Amino acid sequence: GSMEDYQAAEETAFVVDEVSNIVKEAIESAIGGNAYQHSKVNQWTTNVVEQTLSQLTKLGKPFKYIVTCVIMQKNGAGLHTASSCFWDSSTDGSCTVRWENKTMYCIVSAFGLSIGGGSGQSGPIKLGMAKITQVDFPPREIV
Amino acid sequence: GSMEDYQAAEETAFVVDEVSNIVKEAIESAIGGNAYQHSKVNQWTTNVVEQTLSQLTKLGKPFKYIVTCVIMQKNGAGLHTASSCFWDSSTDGSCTVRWENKTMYCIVSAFGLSIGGGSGQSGPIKLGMAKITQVDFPPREIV
């Protein structure tokens, strides 16, 4: 088809290295330098991404974003998650943020599916392949 | 843009009601009518979707499909999962498959992001909105 009739601007396209910082500046803004807390990270990773993931979509281009987040407990309660996702850097848009606590684990992951050619990053490019991403936190082992 | 210069065929486009059956015909093919088992469902939901999700992608159109699967245990081990996905039927492509066992839980979910106009389903259309989808299987309650 005649996609060549139009184009897209690389100056309005976002980058993974930017999105990976938008989450920190938004979390630390929500914290405001308050007292050191553990279970607060659970309400922060949810409350932040709630507006932040919406905001960074606007700092980039309009496309299908998604996120998934997994709140485990080191107290004794974990499971087998299997994620048929793929890592991409120059190929496509993907990002992720990992915030561990004293006895809790709060890990959020993001996939920004973009086919419009939004590229031009400052960092080096890396050729390779991607495969299935399983994630299992075993709370114990077999005796 | 000049997208109107080309088109897409609705006769090659898949439907959610079809994909929702491709999983059963593939699972029961892998079972072959063998002895009744519990932990087998875990190897079946993984092994099937491994080739089946690849196959139904070919029975439809070439696009970015993803799946996520969450294997819990009713023995005492569950967690807080939070999925910023959305349900769609006529708007976009989404499907999901739920296989519970005696003491185990095996739930797989799928998102088939398709903007090419692949529609024309046999079932009725339903207008509405979609929101954030949390998944929490509490193994106990607070005393």
Side-chain angles (χ1 to χ4, degrees), chain A residues 38-50:
Chain A
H38 311 133
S39 300
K40 276 283 141 62
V41 180
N42 305 55
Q43 66 162 73
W44 290 336
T45 192
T46 195
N47 181 270
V48 174
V49 176
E50 219 278 292

Side-chain angles (χ1 to χ4, degrees), chain B residues 6-137:
Chain B
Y6 72 96
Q7 215 82 264
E10 296 130 283
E11 59 175 72
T12 192
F14 75 100
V15 61
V16 176
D17 186 71
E18 174 137 273
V19 169
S20 185
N21 184 77
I22 308 180
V23 72
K24 283 105 214 290
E25 75 109 276
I27 293 159
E28 305 219 294
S29 181
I31 299 168
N34 235 281
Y36 275 51
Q37 286 273 34
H38 310 133
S39 300
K40 276 283 141 62
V41 180
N42 304 55
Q43 66 162 73
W44 290 336
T45 192
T46 195
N47 181 270
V48 174
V49 176
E50 219 277 291
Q51 301 194 123
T52 293
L53 205 291
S54 182
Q55 161 161 62
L56 67 93
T57 295
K58 319 324 209 298
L59 282 162
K61 276 196 90 278
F63 259 109
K64 273 279 193 168
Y65 302 84
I66 196 136
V67 297
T68 35
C69 183
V70 182
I71 315 300
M72 249 87 76
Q73 228 203 146
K74 199 224 288 164
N75 179 255
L79 78 318
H80 252 266
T81 294
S83 311
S84 192
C85 327
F86 303 85
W87 152 267
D88 292 288
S89 180
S90 193
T91 359
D92 294 288
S94 300
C95 200
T96 172
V97 204
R98 59 106 178 195
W99 280 67
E100 63 186 85
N101 317 327
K102 240 228 175 192
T103 196
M104 278 261 216
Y105 266 82
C106 313
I107 55 124
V108 59
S109 195
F111 298 92
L113 287 308
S114 287
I115 57 72
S119 63
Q121 56 245 94
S122 188
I125 63 109
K126 308 94 71 116
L127 183 62
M129 71 185 186
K131 308 291 290 199
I132 311 309
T133 304
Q134 195 196 94
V135 34
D136 167 46
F137 232 71

